[PDB]
Curated annotation (Swiss-Prot), chain A:
Chain sites annotated for binding GTP: 130-137, 164-167, 232-235, 266-268
Activity-regulation annotation: GTPase activity is stimulated by the presence of 50S ribosomal subunits. Hydrolysis is probably regulated by the HflX N-terminal domain.
The protein, known as: GTPase HflX
Annotated gene: hflX
Main location: cytoplasm
Species assigned in the record: Saccharolobus solfataricus (strain ATCC 35092 / DSM 1617 / JCM 11322 / P2)
InterPro entries attached to this UniProt entry: G_HFLX_dom (IPR030394), GTP-bd (IPR006073), GTP-bd_M (IPR032305), GTPase_HflX (IPR016496), GTPase_HflX_N (IPR025121), GTPase_HflX_N_sf (IPR042108), P-loop_NTPase (IPR027417), Small_GTP-bd (IPR005225)
Compartment list: Cytoplasm
Entry keyword set: Cytoplasm, GTP-binding, Magnesium, Metal-binding, Nucleotide-binding
Curated annotation (Swiss-Prot), chain B:
One Pfam family linked to the record: GTP-bdg_M
Protein name as catalogued: GTPase HflX
Keywords: Cytoplasm, GTP-binding, Magnesium, Metal-binding, Nucleotide-binding
Organism: Saccharolobus solfataricus (strain ATCC 35092 / DSM 1617 / JCM 11322 / P2)
Signal peptide residue numbers: none
Keyword hit for Magnesium: yes
Cofactor: Mg(2+)
Subcellular locations according to the entry: Cytoplasm
Residues of the Hflx-type G domain: 125-288
HAMAP family: GTPase_HflX
Family: Belongs to the TRAFAC class OBG-HflX-like GTPase superfamily. HflX GTPase family.
A single cellular component GO annotation: cytoplasm
Amino acid sequence: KTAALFVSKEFEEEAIALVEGANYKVTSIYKLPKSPNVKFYIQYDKLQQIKNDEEISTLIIFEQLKPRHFINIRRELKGKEVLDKILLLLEIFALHAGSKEAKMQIELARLKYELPIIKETNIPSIGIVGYTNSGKTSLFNSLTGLSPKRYAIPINNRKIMLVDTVPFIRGIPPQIVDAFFVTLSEAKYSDALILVIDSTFSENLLIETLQSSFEILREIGVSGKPILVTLNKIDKINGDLYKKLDLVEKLSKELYSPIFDVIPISALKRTNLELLRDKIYQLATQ
Amino acid sequence: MKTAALFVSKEFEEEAIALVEGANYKVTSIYKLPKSPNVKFYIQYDKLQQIKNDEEISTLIIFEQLKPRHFINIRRELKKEVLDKILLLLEIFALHAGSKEAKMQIELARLKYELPIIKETNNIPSIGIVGYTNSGKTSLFNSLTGLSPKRYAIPINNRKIMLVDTVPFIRGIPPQIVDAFFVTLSEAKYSDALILVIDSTFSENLLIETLQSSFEILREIGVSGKPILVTLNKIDKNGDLYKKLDLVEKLSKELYSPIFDVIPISALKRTNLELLRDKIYQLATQLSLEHHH
């Protein structure tokens, strides 16, 4: 399932991750029209370009489109799929959804958002949490060897259920707030959690990401559950590791308890994944 | 065809049966609403178990609004569907609904209702047949069709007409599913013509009220300009036929335009159906000649 993405240079990092995570292939990428169109939001010529390309099956614009935009765009594409930020996020929610209640909440938001468009015409369970593009999915895939979003991997002689929960999202549209939390709250069930953090950030950003990640966990009601913090993407660090490791370790234990451990990793390069496996086992045994 | 056990009061029984059967159910057994609803299951536990073990009964239908508590307790026992008035009506709308908006409205309302529940855990004209759930609508549809399909094409001479068994007019609809019903019924506005079925078994004033209400509803849903063929049904059920016929004919022509014709029929006894078919054909001819040069 291919896709054409229209995202700003700033949110492009976020969008690409979300798109790929939604089982979509990023076949094309475009900027944001300085002055968005009134009828189609994107310029008509580009729209026709998307229409005239058998290699594109889904148009994705990382913004909130008005019903008239969907009406006109769909009226032009006639056969291809069109998605905005809200529809994209909802699709992702449904993928990570594990409970029926979550399914319904997600579908409810989708319907409420789609109506106006047609109107105007014992095995332990570990939950991997963190912001998108923190390496979460990559970490999950590296451990599983893989879109299950919930795979039980054998470590030593113990079988462990890994759950790639819905990623933390910044700037969540009010419409899908309920659907999001109901989906994320599925993490409360997990016996333990793996908090994934992007190490590439600076100190000011690391502190923010940590405080935000833990804040969100409090918001859903996570308490007393063992949390293993993994400093991911150490392969793309243009600085020092221990300095950030000690910072993260200290700040985490100040913001939450119990903290099982804090280890640096690299989902892509497999760096320290064997150590992670060991720590996951020690946690499972515990 | 699915079987169902119906719990309903006497005043709503007749309407309940028609609605249930309209949802493709054969009512095998009928009970009245419990004097004092069961705190736990609403329905008497013993009766619930009896229906639970009766393989000749696939679905339980209670013609009343159940509390989320009841749905939960009843469902953990049946393992068989349980339907209250709201879920029943929504299930009925879904069968008629052909538009995406209606489907979504119905589904929305359903997901809504279920949310708390689980949260507490060439040249083919369309002729729509409209009327109340007591006008013998379905019977007429089945007679002209020869029968369930909610839409069915019938051959008349050299023309073939698409008959549409639209959702019946329903009185006292739960506020929760009003939007779902309205949209589903509004689909009748996209028909080229309509057959308004009228229950003749009503008295003088009641008949007028039914007729007036029928046209009023047809107005609310946005029907206008469409030729309407009024059929005074159940003439076999008596005596003052011509009396009520004249009132209907005269009142109808004064209530709406254009009125194609007004004919008396008996869906069950299949009386005057041939004439009806003729009128349908003539109507089809008119519709095909409307925008011609």
